[PDB]
Design an enzyme around this catalytic site. Structure first.
Site, short mmCIF file in Angstrom:
data_model
loop_
_atom_site.label_atom_id
_atom_site.label_comp_id
_atom_site.label_asym_id
_atom_site.label_seq_id
_atom_site.Cartn_x
_atom_site.Cartn_y
_atom_site.Cartn_z
CG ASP A 24 41.12 11.11 99.51
OD1 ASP A 24 40.90 11.99 100.36
OD2 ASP A 24 40.38 10.95 98.52
CG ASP A 51 42.11 14.77 103.07
OD1 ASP A 51 41.09 15.49 103.12
OD2 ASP A 51 42.08 13.57 102.75
CE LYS A 56 22.82 10.29 86.11
NZ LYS A 56 22.91 9.52 84.84
CG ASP A 106 39.25 12.31 102.99
OD1 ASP A 106 38.27 13.26 102.83
OD2 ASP A 106 39.25 11.34 102.24
MG LIG Z 1 38.74 11.71 99.84
#
Ligand SMILES: [Mg+2]
Ligand SMILES: CC(C)CCC[C@@H](C)[C@H]1CC[C@H]2[C@@H]3CC=C4C[C@@H](O)CC[C@]4(C)[C@H]3CC[C@]12C
Ligand SMILES: C[C@]12CC[C@H](O)C[C@H]1CC[C@@H]1[C@@H]2CC[C@]2(C)[C@@H](c3ccc(=O)oc3)CC[C@]12O
Ligand SMILES: *[C@@H]1O[C@H](CO)[C@@H](O)[C@H](O)[C@H]1NC(C)=O
Ligand SMILES: [K+]
Ligand SMILES: [K+]
Ligand SMILES: [K+]
Lengths: 32, 288, 996
Positions: free
Chosen positions: C690, C694, C460, C349
């Site tokens: 993380d 995942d 923005k 990841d």
């Molecule tokens: Mg991540």
């Protein structure tokens, strides 16, 4: 007589040996 | 069914098999070669006359003619098939001792009709030729094996067993001293003979029921020193060790009474782990 | 029907997210401003379930101890035990010995499996203890609105379809459809993998509910601003809830070591039942009855099973896990210490895994030149020239327009690693200026903020106006930042070296291609500008409000660009370097945007310099993308968009023909499908990650690897390994350790199996040649369980025979742990030398004690008979039972001592599978000790008082020790020249046949 073996001095020898060998191995795995 | 036959191979992979099989034939060949080598040297370290260690046989064992399944003779006085096995064991045992069986005055030496001082023949060297052997005649056991004179049921009415000492090379039996500590009603021949006595139970309360008669050499219950030392299967094949028969005459029939037999001497000892060492145990029941 | 469940769960999601407020409130039965009634809330809360994840479907009871008692190996030993008790049961056919033999042995086997189970269960228990020790759940209350009054209530009392207000710092309680927002940016990092804060606005933006801006997610934190929303999803009905429940519903496959142990097990059983059957037949063939023959079969089969190897193996693995646990890498599973070594592919990841996930300022554009900041964590890099006035003006403008402030507790902390309340960009800016230009606080209050416009979600543009601290000019100062193209739209002048200028299209397009260079570099780019105000028109007392416009928003002065990105963790590029070097295939999988993902992958070494995607080739070639033949491109970036539309064969071609791969914009389910796509190939896959996205992939992978701090809870739970320090370099150590123990395991295994020959052969020829038994039950146990243990464990302290990271991962189909060559060694060659040495001492002792070998045959019949007390040796001497039997037991002892003596040599030579013993040296201390003790204890069993009684082990005449020596020496020599020829000829016949 031939019919007497001294198994006491042999026993004692093997045991002293065991002691030494072991504590020597202890000495080896502690290297300081 | 996969590996057994594959493209270019026998199960598992067979192209090179000849290589592995040859290699193992040669390698194992050399292993066997080596082993037999070491065994050969080791056999060159083995004396042709005496064993390099005797110490495990040191306290000789007391053994019997009719060695039983477990120390037990149980039989019928009437039935001929009852005492068959024991009696047979006796006949095949003392088949060696027959008078015509030792004819030769070359290899056989007629020693005393009375127990005599130990017979020392030279040394254990081959410097002296093959050693003579002291004769033992069956008559020395009277009423027990009796030559061809009685029993002949060999105990048929009341039981009898021959006590024999184990052969140990170089062993020179020393009977107890003329100062003897409680040796039981035994004769005065302590100088020339190793004694044997029997009791119901060892040190404890016995169901001792019996009367015994022993037949040794010369009328003493034991083994004469004149047969010892035994010089080995190389130097004295056709050597006949001493024997002494023990006949139990009066006993209580339908019950099992236990027997302990003991050989006494300075050269004799006993083990509590080994009941056949230095001593003897027999359970006997004659039922009818 | 949990299969259908897992089928619907593997599917990426849908939503009602695109709606008019009228329709949403029509379907949910709610008031927009007033939420719903407290009655309706306590009604819905009781209708389905409270808002929280159903606690794990797991929590097995401590009776799970039983698990450690079977496996496959403990099964081999259980079955062996059962066979002991069987053969004993059969031996109750007569009056019999096994009270010291078969019963005793069976009990021992059972004791081995039980003890082993206790040990491994205890250690895995240790692991779970520390994991739960790391668990901290601090309750957080949701701010809801019911009956018009904002009420802060338990987040578990939150229902579907009621108004909720979130502020900066507030964690999002449930899945909300956004009705209204002011300057609201939420962190989607953990859940969607979107690195930069994704701004949230009521508007429908993207078709995919994840990337759309009107949906707020369970477990994501609102980083700044305020918002309100109706709760679409509660509890497990949420996104992270479906993710977590998909996680719990998966399987971890079979660990490769489980498979190797199984293979080996079919090897040992194979040889055991082969020998036992062949010998059952053979024993029948001579004399022995079905009874005794059965006893023989059982005896041999069971003698062939190594009780000690289970204990020793558990302990080897456990030692390696002691090193892992020392290095802050925790394995939840004890068989998971190896898997890394056999991993041919790692799916990683990106955000919060490879990358710090912490946005930092990379480059800046000031005075036409692009200068790089120092992006390193400890500031060991380079700071460029800060002396220029333009950089001063710029840093002023960047600091002055920040809603991010340093919180109360950060002073002592480093400027980088310290915490900040506010946006991610505003945190990176705040820290950049607190670092390089001096403290931001002073300069922030030096210019007093009058009115500010929080960033519109549209255009923005975020601006504020302050007074002037400068002693020369008391003009009103206006500062604005935003999108580079909109900040190009509204402006005229530009500042260079402290003096203005109009914009010419040359330098305008210089700024535009600079923006395109830094933006295309993967770093997102923020433009910066200011205008002093005409204080003649805008006096010092003038109040300019946000009601409408009091300000010229055009003809401003543009200053410069600031660009920013989240760098990697420091040891990541070198780590991936090592893994590419080891031959593992490194693959990126991220839910992030591809523009960042490709730059990151290029950076850390996943896509190396000098490799191009079809898109890069077509970029240099000035041709349509479909023109370029895709087989000519090594590296590729696969959109998440295509992934859903792709089939199995398409994924297989993409994974087969592409060396360096990246997947971006991918949902968690697509991740699990990627991993399964790699696993289809037949290759062991490891997954490092993380956040909760995942969870399904690191679960499915043969081994999961999570991050111990910056990783989420469900993806720690679904993972078979944790890194507590979050150090990614530990991964490398993993693939190192896993690669080592394997070979060491082999060595260990070889060693123990080699003791099986000289142990078993005593009972074999006992039946065949009918000699008095050479080696007994207790002696054999004194070997397997008593002596060999220390040497066998010491073998795990072996180092690397050569560089192990230089060789490609093993072939799980070809390279096996216990293989035909190993058994060819232990049983075939060495083991035989050991058996021979044994029967040597046997014959030495016996012949020396009066029974010559020639005469020794056929003897057992009379020999093991208890009642034959006249037994003739070769000398015509007679032996009672206990006399000769003592000799047999003092023939057991030196055969056992022989086993020790040969196990010396075997130990030294198993130490080295390839190199000579004079290469690897003797440097292993546990090995040396192993020798010293193994012997000391052997001499202890022989020469201890009361062993003859207790163990039927009696003293040796010292000569007996020296019988076994030549054989041991032969073993050393033989194996040494073998490992010589293998080295000098790696063709090779010795190498094909022996090397294991
Ligand atoms: Mg991540
Ligand atoms: C790797 C090898 C060569 C290690 C060398 C160790 C040898 C020399 C040691 C190990 C075991 C030792 C024996 C252990 C028992 C004793 C009993 C003692 O009463 C006589 C010597 C004797 C028999 C020892 C002789 C020396 C011995 C054989
Ligand atoms: C008791 C025994 C019965 C068969 C024959 O009478 C010989 C007897 C003595 C030896 C004994 C066998 C029984 C199996 C063994 C333990 C068996 C064994 C040995 C070691 C081991 O680990 O597992 C089984 C093989 C031989 C064995 O040791
Ligand atoms: C031997 O037997 C005969 C008759 O059977 C008997 O008269 C004699 O007393 C017995 N003698 C011994 C010593 O047993
Ligand atoms: K075994
Ligand atoms: K898993
Ligand atoms: K073994």
């Amino acid at each position: 007589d031939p019919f007497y073996y001294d198994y006491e001095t042999v026993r004692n020898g093997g045991l002293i040996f065991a002691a030494l060998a072991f504590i020597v191995g202890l000495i080896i795995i502690l290297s300081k | 069914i996969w590996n057994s036959e594959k493209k270019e191979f026998l199960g598992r992979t067979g192209g090179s098999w000849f290589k592995i099989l040859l290699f193992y034939v040669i390698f194992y060949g050399c292993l066997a070669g080596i082993f037999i080598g070491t065994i050969q040297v080791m056999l060159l370290t083995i004396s042709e006359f005496k064993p390099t260690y005797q110490d495990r046989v040191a306290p000789p064992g007391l053994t019997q003619i009719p060695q039983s399944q477990k120390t037990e003779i149980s039989f019928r006085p009437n039935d001929p098939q009852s005492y068959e096995s024991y009696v047979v064991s006796i006949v095949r045992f003392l088949e060696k001792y027959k008078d015509l069986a030792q004819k030769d005055d070359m290899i056989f030496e007629d020693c005393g009709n009375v127990p005599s001082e130990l017979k020392e023949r030279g040394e254990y060297n081959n410097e002296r030729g093959e050693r003579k052997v002291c004769r033992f005649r069956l008559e020395w056991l009277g009423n027990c094996s009796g030559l061809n004179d009685e029993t002949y049921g060999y105990k048929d009415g009341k039981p009898c067993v021959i006590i024999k000492l184990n052969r140990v090379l170089g062993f020179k039996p020393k009977p107890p001293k003329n100062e003897s500590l409680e040796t039981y009603p035994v004769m005065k021949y302590n100088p020339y003979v190793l004694p044997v006595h029997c009791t119901g139970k060892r040190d404890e309360d016995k169901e001792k029921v019996g009367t015994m008669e022993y037949f040794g050499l010369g009328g003493y219950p034991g083994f004469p020193l004149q047969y010892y030392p035994y010089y080995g299967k190389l130097l004295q094949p056709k050597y006949l060790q001493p024997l002494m028969a023990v006949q139990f005459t009066n006993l209580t029939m339908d019950t099992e009474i236990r027997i302990e037999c003991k050989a006494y001497g300075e050269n004799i000892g006993y083990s509590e782990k080994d009941r056949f060492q230095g001593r003897f145990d027999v359970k006997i029941e004659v039922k009818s | 029907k949990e299969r259908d469940m897992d089928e619907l769960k593997k599917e990426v999601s849908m939503d009602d997210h695109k709606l008019s407020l009228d329709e949403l409130h029509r379907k949910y039965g709610t008031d927009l401003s007033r939420g719903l009634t407290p009655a309706r809330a306590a009604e819905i809360l009781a209708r389905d379930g409270p808002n929280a994840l159903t606690p794990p479907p797991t929590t097995p009871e401590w009776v799970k101890f039983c698990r450690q008692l079977f496996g496959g190996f403990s099964m081999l030993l259980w079955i062996g035990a059962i066979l002991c008790f069987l053969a004993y049961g059969i031996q109750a056919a007569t009056e019999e010995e096994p009270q010291n033999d078969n019963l005793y042995l069976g009990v021992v086997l059972s004791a081995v499996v039980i003890i082993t189970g206790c040990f491994s269960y205890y250690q895995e228990a240790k692991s779970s203890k520390i994991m739960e020790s790391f668990k901290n759940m601090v309750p957080q209350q949701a701010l809801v609105i019911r009956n018009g009054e904002k009420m802060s209530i338990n987040a578990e009392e939150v229902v579907v379809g009621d108004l909720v207000e979130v502020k900066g710092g507030d964690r999002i309680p449930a899945d909300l459809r956004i009705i209204s927002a002011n300057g609201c940016k939420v962190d989607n990092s953990s859940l969607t993998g979107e690195s930069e804060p994704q701004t949230r606005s009521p508007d429908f933006t993207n078709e995919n509910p994840l990337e759309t801006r009107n949906i707020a997610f369970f477990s994501t934190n609102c980083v700044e601003g305020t918002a309100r929303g109706i709760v679409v999803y509660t509890g497990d009905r949420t996104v992270m809830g479906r993710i977590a429940t998909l996680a719990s519903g998966l399987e971890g496959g079979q660990t490769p070591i489980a498979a190797e142990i199984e293979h080996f097990i079919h090897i040992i059983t194979g040889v055991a039942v082969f020998l036992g059957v062949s010998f059952f037949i053979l024993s029948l063939i001579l004399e022995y009855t079905w009874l005794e023959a059965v006893i023989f079969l059982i005896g041999i089969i069971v003698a062939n099973v190594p009780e000690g190897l289970l204990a020793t193996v558990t302990v080897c693995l456990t030692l390696t896990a002691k090193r892992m646990a020392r290095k802050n890498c925790l394995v939840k599973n004890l068989e998971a210490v190896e898997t890394l070594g056999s991993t041919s592919t790692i799916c990683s990841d990106k955000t919060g895994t490879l990358t710090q996930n912490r946005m930092t300022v990379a480059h800046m554009w000031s005075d036409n030149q692009i200068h790089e900041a120092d992006t390193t964590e400890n500031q060991s890099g380079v700071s460029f020239d800060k002396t220029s006035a333009t950089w001063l003006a710029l840093s002023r403008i960047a600091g002055l327009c920040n809603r991010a402030v340093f919180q109360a507790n950060q002073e002592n902390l480093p400027i980088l690693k310290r915490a900040v309340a506010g946006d991610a960009s505003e945190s990176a800016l705040l820290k950049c200026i607190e670092l390089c230009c001096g403290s931001v606080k002073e300069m922030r209050e030096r210019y007093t903020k009058i009115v500010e416009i929080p960033f519109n979600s549209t255009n923005k543009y975020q601006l504020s106006i302050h007074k002037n601290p400068n002693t020369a000019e008391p003009r009103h100062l206006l500062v604005m930042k935003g999108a580079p193209e909109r900040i190009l739209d509204r402006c005229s002048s530009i500042l260079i070296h402290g003096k203005e200028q109009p914009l010419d299209e040359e330098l305008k397009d210089a700024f535009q291609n600079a923006y395109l260079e830094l933006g295309g570099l993967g770093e997102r780019v923020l433009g910066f500008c200011h205008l002093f105000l005409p204080d003649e028109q805008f006096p010092e007392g003038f109040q300019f409000d946000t009601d409408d416009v009091n300000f010229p928003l055009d003809n401003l002065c543009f200053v410069g660009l600031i660009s920013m990105i989240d760098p990697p963790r420091a040891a990541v590029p070198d780590a991936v370097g090592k893994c590419r070097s080891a031959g593992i295939k490194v693959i990126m999988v991220t839910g992030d945007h591809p523009i960042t993902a490709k730059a990151i992958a290029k950076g850390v070494g996943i896509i190396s310099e000098g490799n191009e995607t079809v898109e890069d080739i077509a970029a240099r070639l000035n041709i349509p993308v479909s023109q370029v033949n895709p087989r000519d491109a090594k590296a590729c970036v696969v959109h998440g968009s295509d992934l859903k539309d792709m089939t199995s064969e398409q994924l297989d071609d993409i994974l087969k023909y592409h060396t360096e791969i990246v997947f971006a914009r991918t949902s968690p389910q697509q991740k699990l499908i990627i991993v399964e796509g790699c696993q289809r190939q037949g290759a062991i896959v490891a997954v490092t990650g993380d956040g909760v996205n995942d969870s399904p992939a690191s679960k499915k992978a043969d081994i999961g690897v999570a991050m111990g701090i910056a990783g989420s809870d469900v993806s720690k739970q679904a993972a078979d390994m944790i890194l507590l320090d979050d150090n990614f370099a530990s991964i490398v150590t993993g693939v190192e350790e896993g690669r080592l123990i394997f070979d060491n395991l082999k060595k260990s295994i070889a060693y123990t199996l080699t003791s099986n020959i000289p142990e078993i052969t005593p009972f074999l020829i006992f039946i065949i040649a009918n000699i008095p038994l050479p080696l007994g039950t207790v002696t054999i146990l004194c070997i397997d369980l008593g002596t060999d243990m220390v040497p066998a464990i010491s073998l795990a302290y072996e180092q690397a025979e050569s560089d192990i990271m230089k060789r490609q991962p093993r072939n799980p189909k070809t390279d096996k742990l216990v293989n035909e060559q190993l058994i060819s060694m232990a049983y075939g060659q060495i083991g035989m030398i050991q058996a021979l040495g044994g029967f040597f001492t046997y014959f030495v002792i016996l012949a020396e004690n009066g029974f010559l070998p020639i005469h020794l045959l056929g003897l057992r019949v009379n020999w093991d008979d208890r009642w034959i007390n006249d037994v003739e040796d070769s000398y015509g001497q007679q032996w009672t039972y206990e006399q000769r039997k003592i000799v047999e037991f003092t023939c057991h002892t030196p055969f056992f001592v022989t086993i020790v003596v040969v196990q010396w040599a075997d130990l030294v030579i198993c130490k080295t599978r390839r190199n000579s013993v004079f290469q690897q040296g003797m440097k292993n201390k546990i090995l040396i000790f192993g020798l010293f003790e193994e012997t000391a204890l052997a001499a202890f069993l022989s020469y201890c008082p009361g062993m003859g009684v207790a163990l039927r082990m009696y003293p040796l005449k010292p000569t007996w020790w020296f019988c076994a020596f030549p054989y041991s020496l032969l073993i050393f020599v033989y194996d040494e020249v073998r490992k010589l020829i293998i080295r000098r000829r790696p063709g090779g016949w010795v190498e094909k046949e022996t090397y294991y």
